[PDB]
Design a protein around this motif. Structure first.
Motif, short mmCIF file in Angstrom:
data_model
loop_
_atom_site.label_atom_id
_atom_site.label_comp_id
_atom_site.label_asym_id
_atom_site.label_seq_id
_atom_site.Cartn_x
_atom_site.Cartn_y
_atom_site.Cartn_z
N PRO A 1 0.80 -1.24 0.00
CA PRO A 1 0.00 0.00 0.00
C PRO A 1 0.83 1.27 0.00
CG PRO A 1 -0.87 -1.60 1.57
CD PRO A 1 0.47 -2.12 1.13
N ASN A 2 1.92 1.32 0.76
CA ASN A 2 2.67 2.56 0.92
C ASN A 2 3.52 2.86 -0.30
OD1 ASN A 2 3.73 4.89 2.05
ND2 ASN A 2 4.23 3.92 4.02
N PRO A 3 3.22 3.94 -1.04
CA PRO A 3 4.02 4.25 -2.23
C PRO A 3 5.43 4.69 -1.91
CG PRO A 3 1.88 5.38 -2.23
CD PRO A 3 2.13 4.90 -0.84
N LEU A 4 5.64 5.36 -0.77
CA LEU A 4 7.00 5.73 -0.37
C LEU A 4 7.87 4.49 -0.20
CD1 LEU A 4 6.47 8.70 2.12
CD2 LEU A 4 6.29 8.60 -0.38
N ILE A 5 7.36 3.46 0.47
CA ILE A 5 8.17 2.27 0.66
C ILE A 5 8.23 1.44 -0.62
CG2 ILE A 5 7.22 2.39 2.98
CD1 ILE A 5 6.15 -0.41 2.62
N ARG A 6 7.22 1.51 -1.49
CA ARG A 6 7.34 0.91 -2.81
C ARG A 6 8.52 1.51 -3.57
NH1 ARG A 6 2.44 2.55 -4.66
NH2 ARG A 6 0.68 1.68 -3.47
N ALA A 7 8.61 2.84 -3.57
CA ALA A 7 9.71 3.52 -4.25
C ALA A 7 11.04 3.20 -3.59
CB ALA A 7 9.46 5.03 -4.27
N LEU A 8 11.07 3.12 -2.26
CA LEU A 8 12.31 2.76 -1.57
C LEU A 8 12.77 1.36 -1.95
CD1 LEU A 8 13.92 4.56 0.40
CD2 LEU A 8 13.08 3.10 2.25
N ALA A 9 11.83 0.41 -2.05
CA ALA A 9 12.18 -0.95 -2.45
C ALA A 9 12.72 -0.98 -3.87
CB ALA A 9 10.96 -1.86 -2.31
N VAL A 10 12.03 -0.31 -4.80
CA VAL A 10 12.50 -0.34 -6.18
C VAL A 10 13.75 0.51 -6.39
CG1 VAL A 10 10.13 -0.75 -6.91
CG2 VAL A 10 11.06 1.54 -6.97
N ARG A 11 14.08 1.38 -5.43
CA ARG A 11 15.36 2.09 -5.47
C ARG A 11 16.50 1.21 -4.96
NH1 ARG A 11 16.30 8.07 -3.95
NH2 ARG A 11 18.56 8.26 -3.61
N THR A 12 16.26 0.45 -3.89
CA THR A 12 17.28 -0.46 -3.38
C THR A 12 17.49 -1.66 -4.30
OG1 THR A 12 16.37 0.16 -1.22
CG2 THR A 12 18.11 -1.50 -1.25
N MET A 13 16.48 -2.02 -5.10
CA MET A 13 16.66 -3.10 -6.07
C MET A 13 17.76 -2.76 -7.08
SD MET A 13 12.83 -4.54 -6.89
CE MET A 13 12.82 -3.30 -8.19
N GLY A 14 17.82 -1.50 -7.52
CA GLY A 14 18.86 -1.10 -8.44
C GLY A 14 20.23 -1.00 -7.81
N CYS A 15 20.30 -0.90 -6.49
CA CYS A 15 21.58 -0.82 -5.79
C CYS A 15 22.14 -2.19 -5.43
CB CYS A 15 21.44 0.03 -4.53
SG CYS A 15 21.15 1.79 -4.84
N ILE A 16 21.28 -3.16 -5.12
CA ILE A 16 21.77 -4.51 -4.85
C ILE A 16 22.28 -5.13 -6.15
CG2 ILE A 16 19.37 -5.27 -4.90
CD1 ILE A 16 20.21 -7.76 -3.39
N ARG A 17 23.56 -5.50 -6.17
CA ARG A 17 24.20 -6.05 -7.36
C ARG A 17 24.25 -7.57 -7.23
NH1 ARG A 17 26.14 -8.35 -11.90
NH2 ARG A 17 27.63 -9.90 -11.12
N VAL A 18 23.46 -8.25 -8.06
CA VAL A 18 23.48 -9.70 -8.15
C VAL A 18 22.74 -10.09 -9.42
CG1 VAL A 18 21.34 -10.09 -6.86
CG2 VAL A 18 23.17 -11.82 -6.78
N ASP A 19 23.02 -11.29 -9.93
CA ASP A 19 22.31 -11.81 -11.09
C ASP A 19 21.03 -12.55 -10.69
OD1 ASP A 19 23.40 -14.06 -9.93
OD2 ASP A 19 24.34 -14.82 -11.75
N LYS A 20 20.56 -12.37 -9.46
CA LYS A 20 19.35 -13.01 -8.97
C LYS A 20 18.07 -12.38 -9.49
CE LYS A 20 19.91 -15.18 -4.41
NZ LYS A 20 19.66 -14.85 -2.98
N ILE A 21 18.16 -11.29 -10.25
CA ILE A 21 16.97 -10.56 -10.66
C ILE A 21 16.70 -10.72 -12.15
CG2 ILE A 21 18.39 -8.48 -10.79
CD1 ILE A 21 15.53 -7.08 -9.97
#
Lengths: 14, 120, 480, 164, 611, 142
Positions: free
Chosen positions: C23-43
């Motif tokens: 529900p929370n768009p701020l934490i949605r954006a935080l999650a999709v921002r940290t996704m670009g920072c975590i470096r792995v081929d798991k995505i």
């Protein structure tokens, strides 16, 4: 009944 | 878009480090430290890596990237950074930057994202 | 044993995927921002965060796209309602590398912030219109961005306008109105800090080479002033010599003479280069320019003297046998020449005026002895000068031309120099009259904008005004 | 099992070559055991860990090769436990005790605190905190710390099973 | 303690500002100046005090205008404290004076005849510290005299030995060998090891230009060294450092033994080899001390023994043992030992016998090149992989050097490129691999590939007739890359202007396609590349007739005819008139196939060795 | 041979400078600046030797103080690395738990002790017993 020790202590017993 | 933003005192030590792109040859801070800190233009190319910089009070605020980027945009971005912390501390100097660590890092987090200048 | 006795001795003295429907768009954006920072081929992990209805989440997810097509490389967005998202889309697309869907891009431009305006400008600059009669409205409805508080927007607006200004050249003076409108923002860009005004000066040099008319009258604006930093001082000098006119030359040389007294070597060298260059546009000054330069040669400060001799070689090229009398005094400075450009300039002028120079053979032999220690740029010019001297005096210069040809052909490691020597040798051995025709011919006299960013390279850099290509005067192939 | 014959000795057993070389006049106490010679066990190691922590002897103490040596020596002299036992895992980071039951690890000190301990020009030059990991192959400033979990979890074996 | 010094130092330290620091410095300078420089009745105590203060003000970083005569006064004294402060002042502070030198030389020769070990030692340490031409001309004869005498102490012996060594280094054209050599060599028989470690250091530099006069050293040195390494258990107390027997004298003896070939006598070379075997065996024994000092000392003497073994290259047993020990140290936890082993077996690779034994550790050296986080040890790993390069290695080693070059520090990228080009040219079993390899260099590097490297590729393509078509095709494909380097433009433009006929029949490799591909990069490059491309373009005019009429369009184009670089303009004009004014015949003659490159010394190796 | 010996602090001040060659005073200054720059950056991952300006430095840090021995490229690294510590140990025994302040207030004796332990660019005496007894002799001496 001694521990995960080096060789000498293994010589003493166990 | 923008590789990193690093801030150094007049001695040469690295006050602040943030890297947006993990394609880092980590002597970049050392490159700016040995080539510029310890030259004749604000933009200097060191091994296909462009360095912009500005200097407030005696502190160095520098930006780094290898891509071809809008030079006026990143320079005015550095100006925006300097204005924001001149409002937040009143004087950009060694101690004022050193005493506030997480404030500077989390404000810079909102200003730009992965080398992209955002708006608050 | 006790601790007292022992202490005496010892003492010396994933969860982010579950947030798709979060529900929370701020934490949605935080999650999709940290996704670009975590470096792995798991995505639909990011597809649903783009399906999101919150525009902040959208702009953040668009940039995350670039973030993770950087580690792993292997259209509808600019139609959204938020100018911020439609600007981040073009930024991401430009980093990754139609006329009807940009109908509201130029309005999201006016609704964006400064960074979004820069992004949309950089994106639209690379576009090309099909029909000018209906795409000149682009320039029209893009002109207001001129003189926005940010320098990046005005630079990118000038870029897009310079690119697009190729329309009918007397257009009921739309061409002239845009020509005249472009000048005040460029001239006000000097009010900014040194870094922004320096990048603006680089771009003004570029644009004054391209369309010299825009700022015909602003040469006094570009005069040098004490508190100007060194890099901008050099840029001001260059643009001042650009905009100098038949009447301006007097004032500009009055100022250049005073500049020539400075302490900065780079400045003084560029200043004497400019007092030399003036003779390209104005000839009545030429002679006295020469006189000043000769007196500087007499001052004998090497760093200024050698740049002066380079410019008098260029002036010899532009004014054939008008200042043939100074040659001798120039030869007077034999051993003081150490930079390759100055050595090659002197070598070329002696090779060209060996008709007047009675001892050109000895003058050019003096260089054959350090042939391999000279640079390739000097070696090529010396070979050419010696073949010209041979064709001019073929009954006294055989030893000399054969020696330089043997050097270039036999001992040289440079394939280009070796091929040039072979070419010269074979041409001279086959047809001497034809070799004369080929090399001692009449050459198109040098004439125009001296620093001469290449014809094609300058049009290429015109479409790079905002980019580092403009400030470097070199393509992005030379540096990425 | 037996009670110590050539099998080691000073030319094949590292502790023997190092024990037979120590002089009583150099350390400060006799290098001969008071209790009959015996090996270190689990219970002895746990009891010694608690004895050393609870009264401020080893907890928070900066690691030194001299320090470790005389700890081995003092325990061998007062208890008869042969110095085959105080070994720790290699590599940068926390050093866990190879002997199961010895509840002491070596944690690295933060660089800020290391520099804050070397501030001022009155600091002794040969103090363990002044050596900057001189005694460490990985050049880390180590510190003795007690851990209860080491008595139930044999972290050394679990991390680096190759020795056993 | 110095009387007035502590208060002055404490006052200097307690300054919060450096301006107040300078003000206090100036106040004390004016005090000492008025007193010395305007007043002469002073005490000796009162001279050493203020001279120490002046020395301190100097070492702080401040100019000293005076104080030298007041030091040369302290030179001649009865108490040693005054002498010491004066000597320290005149040694730290050095000037172009003449009266000064006269006076301090008189003081030195007075101290050298005082028959006092402390005064003689002060004089000798002074002469060795300052070491000017004047004191060399005044004392270079008497130092060999006081070196060997029945009344000379040991401290004076070693001081005079090192002082004569300094003089021999500073005035080699002003010191002969004379008669003392027979008795100077005998100093290795001395029970005192300080005189021995001084005499060894002196003889080591002496026998570099006079090996002959000191052939007697080797016998004495091997015997003494043996005794050291083998008496270890009890007897040399004052020279056992962390259970290590006289390590510094050991390394000095081992370095002295390297000024000579193997011993010319079996009775001494056998003792030498047995001592080396004992040194190698002692390092495999369990250490008597867990301190890093014992480790570092015995490993220093071991590395010096390995250097001596490498120098001799006589005993292959010692060579193999040293190689195995260095390979063992390649896995050590201490970065110092890994560095030194990568450095030592790099030189071991020179020997014919140990080269394969060294090649054994190639996998671990590659692992160190990819794993280690210190750049100096990775440089040593590169140097070792390049020391062990041979025909069996070249492919793998060049591949790993290439992979390491793309993420390497730019400060060293040029040396790696030079070494890769050298290995590729030296061990090319298939020259297609050579051209591929240094084209890979240009792709990755190219700001770091020198003039000499991309010259050598063209020379080798010209000389090798059977790889010309491959070079043409491959460099065409490389030019078709999205972003290609300017050096690739140079190499490809040349290869094509010469052998682009070898692919021209193909439509994708057609003449006009090649010309458009070259001119698509013509303006991106600087003037030398543009001149090379003008040569390529006239070669294309001659080689392919159809493009003629088009290329002339570029030649009389005002950008080429009115160019402001004289070389570009003259090439354009000359080549244009060859397209028009000259016969079709003589263009073919002028542009005939280029002859092979003469066999010459590789300028790449010279580029490496100049750095 | 030892080209020079420097004792500096992390701040940048020189506690000892013994030169064994002839350097211009500005050469000395630039040398000091650049050796300090190159040695005050390294950490645990680094070796105690640095290759620069045609020679080597073998350095060791003791609390606030960097002991650098600058020697030729053909000198033993571990030998000088342990000569540093040998010299520091005789300093400790002479100054009774030496600290940096001792090398500032008693700077004139540090030069005598380095001249006793090194001379003319090489190692003179390594025996702690002998050099300590010599210093104790000189202390009682007038």
């Amino acid at each position: 009944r001694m521990s995960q020790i080096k060789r000498l202590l293994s010589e003493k017993k166990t | 878009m923008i590789g990193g933003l690093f801030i150094y005192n007049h001695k040469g030590e690295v006050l602040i480090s943030r890297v947006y792109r993990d394609d880092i040859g980590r002597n970049a801070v050392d490159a700016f430290r040995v080539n510029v800190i310890h030259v004749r233009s604000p933009v200097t190319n060191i091994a296909r890596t462009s360095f912009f910089h500005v200097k407030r009070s005696n502190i160095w605020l520098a930006a780094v990237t290898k891509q071809n980027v809008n030079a006026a945009m990143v320079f005015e971005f550095l100006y925006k950074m300097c204005d924001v912390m001149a409002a937040y501390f009143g004087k950009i100097s060694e101690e004022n930057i050193k005493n506030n660590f997480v404030l500077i890092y989390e404000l810079l987090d909102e200003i730009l994202d992965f080398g992209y200048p955002q708006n608050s | 044993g006790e601790i007292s006795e022992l202490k005496a001795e010892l003492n010396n003295e994933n969860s982010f995927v579950k947030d798709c429907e979060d529900p929370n768009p701020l934490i949605r954006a935080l999650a999709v921002r940290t996704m670009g920072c975590i470096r792995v081929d798991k995505i639909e992990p990011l597809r649903k965060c783009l399906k999101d209805e919150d525009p902040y989440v959208r702009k953040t997810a668009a940039v995350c796209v670039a973030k993770l097509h950087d580690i792993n490389a292997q259209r509808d967005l600019i139609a959204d309602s938020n100018p911020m998202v439609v600007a981040n889309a073009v930024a991401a697309l430009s980093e990754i590398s139609n006329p009807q869907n940009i109908n509201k891009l130029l309005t999201a431009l006016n609704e964006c912030t400064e960074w979004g305006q820069i992004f949309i400008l950089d994106c639209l600059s690379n576009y090309n219109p099909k029909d000018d009669r209906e795409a000149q409205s682009i320039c029209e409805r893009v002109t207001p961005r001129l003189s926005h508080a940010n320098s990046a927007v005005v630079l990118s607006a000038v870029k897009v306008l310079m690119k697009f200004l190729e329309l009918l050249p007397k257009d009921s003076d739309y061409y002239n109105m845009l020509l005249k409108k472009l000048a005040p923002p460029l001239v006000t860009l000097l009010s900014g800090e040194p870094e922004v005004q320096y990048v603006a000066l680089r771009n003004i040099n570029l644009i004054v080479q391209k369309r010299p008319e825009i700022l015909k009258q602003e040469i006094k604006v570009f005069f040098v002033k004490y508190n100007d930093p060194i890099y901008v001082k050099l840029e001001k000098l260059d643009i001042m010599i650009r905009l100098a006119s038949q009447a301006n030359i007097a004032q500009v040389l009055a100022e250049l003479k005073e500049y020539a007294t400075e302490v900065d070597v780079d400045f003084v060298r560029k200043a004497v280069r400019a007092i030399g260059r003036c003779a390209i546009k104005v000839e009545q000054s030429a002679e006295r320019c020469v006189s000043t330069l000769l007196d500087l040669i007499q001052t004998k400060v090497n760093y200024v003297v050698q740049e002066a001799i380079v410019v008098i070689r260029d002036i010899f090229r532009k004014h054939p046998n008008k200042y043939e009398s100074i040659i001798a005094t120039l030869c007077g400075n034999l051993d003081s020449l150490d930079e390759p450009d100055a050595r090659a300039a002197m070598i070329w002028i002696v090779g060209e005026y060996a008709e007047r120079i009675d001892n050109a053979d000895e003058l050019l032999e003096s260089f054959l002895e350090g042939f391999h220690d000279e640079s390739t740029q000097v070696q090529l010019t010396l070979l050419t000068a010696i073949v010209k001297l041979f064709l001019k005096k073929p009954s006294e210069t055989q030893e000399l031309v054969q020696q330089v040809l043997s050097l270039a052909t036999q001992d040289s490691d440079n394939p280009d120099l070796r091929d040039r020597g072979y070419i010269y040798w074979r041409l001279l051995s086959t047809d001497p009259v034809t070799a004369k025709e080929v090399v001692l011919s009449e050459k198109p006299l040098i004439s125009e904008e001296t620093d001469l960013i290449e014809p094609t390279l300058l049009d290429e850099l015109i479409c790079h005004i905002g980019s580092l290509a403009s400030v470097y005067h070199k393509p992005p192939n030379a540096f990425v | 099992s037996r009670d110590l014959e050539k099998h080691n000795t000073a030319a094949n057993n590292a502790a023997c070559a190092w024990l037979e070389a120590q002089e009583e006049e150099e350390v400060g106490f006799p290098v001969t055991p008071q209790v009959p010679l015996r090996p270190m066990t689990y219970k002895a190691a746990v009891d010694l860990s608690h004895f050393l922590k609870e009264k401020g002897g080893l907890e928070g103490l900066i690691h030194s090769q001299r320090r470790q040596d005389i700890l081995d020596l003092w325990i061998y002299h007062t208890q008869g436990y042969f110095p085959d036992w105080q070994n720790y895992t290699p590599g940068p980071g926390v050093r866990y005790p190879l002997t199961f039951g010895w509840c002491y690890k070596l944690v690295p000190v933060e660089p800020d605190k290391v520099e804050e301990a070397n501030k001022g020009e009155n600091t002794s030059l040969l103090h363990p905190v002044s050596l900057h990991g001189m005694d460490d192959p990985e050049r880390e400033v180590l510190e003795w710390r007690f851990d209860s979990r080491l008595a139930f979890h044999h972290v050394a074996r679990e991390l680096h099973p190759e020795y056993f | 303690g110095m009387r007035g010094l502590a208060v002055f130092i404490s006052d200097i330290r307690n300054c919060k500002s450096k301006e107040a620091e300078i003000k206090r410095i100036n106040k004390e300078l004016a005090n000492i100046r008025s007193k010395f420089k305007g007043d002469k009745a002073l005490d000796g105590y009162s001279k050493k005090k203020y001279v120490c203060k002046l020395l301190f003000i100097f070492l702080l970083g401040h100019d000293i205008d005076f104080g030298h005569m007041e030091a040369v006064n302290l030179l001649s004294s009865n108490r040693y404290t005054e002498k010491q402060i004066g000597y320290l002042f005149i040694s730290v502070l050095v000037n172009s004076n003449s009266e000064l030198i006269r006076l301090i030389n008189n003081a030195i020769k007075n101290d050298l005849a005082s028959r006092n070990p402390t005064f003689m030692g002060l004089a000798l340490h002074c002469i060795a510290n300052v070491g000017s031409r004047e004191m060399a001309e005044a004392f270079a004869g008497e130092i060999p005299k006081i070196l060997v005498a029945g009344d000379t102490m040991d401290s004076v012996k070693q001081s005079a030995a090192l002082c004569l060594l300094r003089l021999y280094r500073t005035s080699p054209d002003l010191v002969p060998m004379g008669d003392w050599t027979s008795r100077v060599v005998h100093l290795l028989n001395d029970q005192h090891l300080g005189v021995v470690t001084a005499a060894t250091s002196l003889i080591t530099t002496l026998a570099q230009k006079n090996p002959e006069e000191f052939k007697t050293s080797v016998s004495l040195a091997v015997s003494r060294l043996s005794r050291i390494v083998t008496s270890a258990s009890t007897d040399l107390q004052d020279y056992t450092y962390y259970f290590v027997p006289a390590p510094w004298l050991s390394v000095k003896l081992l370095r002295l033994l390297q000024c000579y070939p193997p011993p010319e006598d079996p009775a001494v070379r056998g003792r030498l080899t047995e001592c080396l075997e004992t040194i190698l065996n002692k390092a495999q024994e369990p250490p008597k001390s867990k301190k890093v000092q014992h480790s570092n000392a015995k490993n220093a003497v071991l590395f010096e023994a390995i250097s001596l073994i490498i120098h001799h290259d006589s005993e292959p047993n010692l060579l193999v043992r040293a190689c195995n020990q260095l390979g063992q140290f390649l896995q050590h936890r201490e970065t110092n030992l890994r560095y030194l082993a990568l450095e030592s077996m790099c030189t071991l690779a020179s020997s014919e016998f140990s080269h394969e034994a060294v090649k054994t550790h190639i996998e671990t050296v590659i692992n160190a090149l990819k794993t280690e986080r210190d750049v100096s040890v990775r440089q040593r790993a590169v140097d070792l992989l390049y020391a062990m390069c041979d025909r069996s290695n070249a492919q793998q080693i060049v591949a790993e050097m290439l992979s390491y070059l793309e993420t390497a520090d730019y400060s060293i990228r040029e040396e790696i490129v030079l070494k890769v080009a050298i290995l590729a040219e030296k061990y090319a079993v298939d020259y297609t691999w050579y051209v591929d390899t240094i084209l890979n260099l240009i792709r990755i590097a190219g700001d770091y590939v020198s003039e000499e490297v991309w010259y050598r590729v063209i020379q080798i393509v010209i000389n090798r007739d059977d790889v010309q078509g491959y070079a043409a095709k491959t460099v065409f494909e490389a030019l078709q890359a999205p972003a290609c380097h300017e050096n690739l433009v140079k190499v490809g433009g040349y290869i094509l202007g010469e052998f682009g006929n070898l692919i021209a029949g193909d439509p994708r490799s057609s003449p006009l396609i090649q010309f458009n591909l070259l001119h698509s990069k013509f303006h991106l490059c600087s003037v030398p590349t543009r001149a090379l491309l003008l040569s390529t373009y006239i070669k294309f005019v001659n080689l392919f007739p159809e493009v003629k009429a088009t290329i002339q369009d570029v030649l009389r184009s005002d950008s080429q005819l009115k160019n402001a670089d004289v070389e570009l303009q003259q090439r354009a004009v000359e080549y244009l008139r060859l397209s028009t004014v000259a016969s079709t015949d003589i263009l073919a003659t002028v542009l005939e196939e280029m002859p092979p490159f003469p066999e010459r010394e590789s300028s790449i190796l010279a580029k490496l060795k100049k750095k | 041979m030892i080209r020079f010996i420097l004792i500096q602090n992390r701040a940048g001040k020189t506690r000892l400078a013994k030169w064994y060659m002839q350097f211009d005073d500005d050469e000395k200054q630039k040398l000091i600046e650049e050796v300090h720059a190159v040695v005050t950056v390294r950490d645990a991952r680094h070796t105690n030797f640095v290759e620069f300006r045609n020679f080597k430095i073998i350095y060791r840090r003791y609390a606030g103080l960097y002991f650098c021995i600058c020697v030729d490229v053909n000198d033993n690294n571990l030998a000088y690395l342990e000569a540093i510590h040998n010299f520091v140990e005789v300093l400790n025994e002479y100054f009774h738990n030496v600290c940096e302040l001792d090398l500032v207030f008693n700077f004139y004796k540090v030069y005598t002790v380095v001249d006793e332990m090194f001379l003319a660019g090489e190692i003179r005496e390594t025996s702690q017993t002998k050099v300590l007894k010599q210093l104790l002799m000189l202390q009682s001496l007038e």
